[PDB]
Amino acid sequence: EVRTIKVFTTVDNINLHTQVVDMSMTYGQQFGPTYLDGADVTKIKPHNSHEGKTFYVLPNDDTLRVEAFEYYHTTDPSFLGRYMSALNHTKKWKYPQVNGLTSIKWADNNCYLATALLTLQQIELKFNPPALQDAYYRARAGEAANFCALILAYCNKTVGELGDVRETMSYLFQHANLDSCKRVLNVVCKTCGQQQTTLKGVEAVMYMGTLSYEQFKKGVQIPCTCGKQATKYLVQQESPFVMMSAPPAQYELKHGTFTCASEYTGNYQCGHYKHITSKETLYCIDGALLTKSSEYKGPITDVFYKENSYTTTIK
Ligand SMILES: O=C(N/N=C/c1ccc[nH]1)c1cc(O)c(O)c(O)c1
Ligand SMILES: [Cl-]
Ligand SMILES: [Zn+2]
């Protein structure tokens, strides 16, 4: 007896492609690598309950290649497999609402993702790939599994791998529309004079070296090619936020002077992030956990600030 069922294949879970599969052969023998809501069914034969269901496959014809690129803005051949592998885990995570924001219950070293997700919900940012647009909308509503799996895939991190928040934000920002963002800096050395530089896009909203936006405006000390220490300060800023990052160090966060921040306790190869948000008071969100305080001091590694347009007064 020959037995078949109808299923649909997809790369973006929107555009469906009708298929007829032989129930005596595995999905892999018929489609190549195949996934059912994240689960790898490549070595599995069709079941009756599969009729009418949607399966992800790899982009193995030109139609799927175009659909995949338009949705994800990547042509990495291993992307869909990494996204599905992550999703099979992230769909089992829990996403509690904590102080009005979608968080993530701790699992699989996902603290860096929780902090990143909580941060995104407090800054003005639009994603460019439809995959991220669609999944971020769902994440804001509380169903963040597909968004978290996409972050992992885009960042080339597997579930359980230790992650860095600054690096993760850099990747997400690279897939965001920051074309309107502009930064002008000036650098003064007593021996070499001045040099002004203009930064755009991701480099216009991120800085590595100090956590304090105010000190960035007053001036920070850096090396120069001659051997002297030069001073760098912010001349002009056009962006809806800025992100200031530094190696973790004890730092005091004062209510009302920042938007949110990331706290890291541990060492290079192992640690834990928490999220601090400045609202009516200071709330510390640690996955599902919530505490509050009027003051905060801790090992801070990233601080986010509101912005619109800033121009210096330094002459
Ligand atoms: O993140 C930064 N660049 N990102 C690059 C990238 C490519 C793909 C993913 N990320 C970055 C670079 C700098 O030179 C900074 O001075 C800085 O603050 C940030
Ligand atoms: Cl978006
Ligand atoms: Zn110099």
Author numbering: 1 to 315
Paper quotes:
The papain-like protease (PLpro) of SARS-CoV-2 is essential for viral propagation and, additionally, dysregulation of the host innate immune system. PLpro can revoke these PTMs by hydrolysing the isopeptide bond at the C-terminus of cellular ubiquitin (Ub) and ISG15, which results in a dysregulation in the production of cytokines and chemokines and type I interferon response. PLpro is a monomer in solution and has a right-handed ubiquitin specific protease (USP) fold which consists of four domains—the N-terminal ubiquitin-like (Ubl) domain, the thumb, palm and fingers domain. PLpro binds ubiquitin and ubiquitin-like proteins at two distinct sites, S1 and S2, thereby providing specificity for K48-polyubiquitin (K48-Ub2) and ISG15.
The hydrazone compound H1 binds in a polar groove at the S1 site of PLpro between β-strand β8 (M206—M208) of the palm and helix α7 (V165—H175) of the thumb domain. In this groove H1 is stabilized by eight hydrogen bonds. Further stabilization is achieved by C-H···π interactions between the phenyl ring of the compound with the side chain of E203 and the pyrrole ring with the aromatic side chain of Y171. At the core of the ubiquitin binding interface around residue I44Ub are four non-covalent bonds between ubiquitin and PLpro (one hydrogen bond, three salt bridges), all of which are likely disrupted by binding of H1. While the hydrogen bonds with G128ISG15 are likely disrupted by the sterical clash of H1 and the ISG15 loop comprising residues F126ISG15 to P130ISG15, the interaction between N151ISG15 and R166 is impaired due to the movement of the arginine side chain by 4.0 Å that forms a hydrogen bond with H1 in the complex structure. The hydrazone H1 is binding directly at the center of the S1 substrate binding interface, interfering with residues R166/E167 which are highly important for substrate recognition. While the thiosemicarbazones show no inhibitory effect on substrate turnover at the tested concentrations, a significant inhibition of the ubiquitin cleavage can be detected for 500 µM of hydrazone H1. Surprisingly, ISG15 turnover in the presence of 500 µM of H1 is not reduced but rather increased twofold compared to ligand-free PLpro.
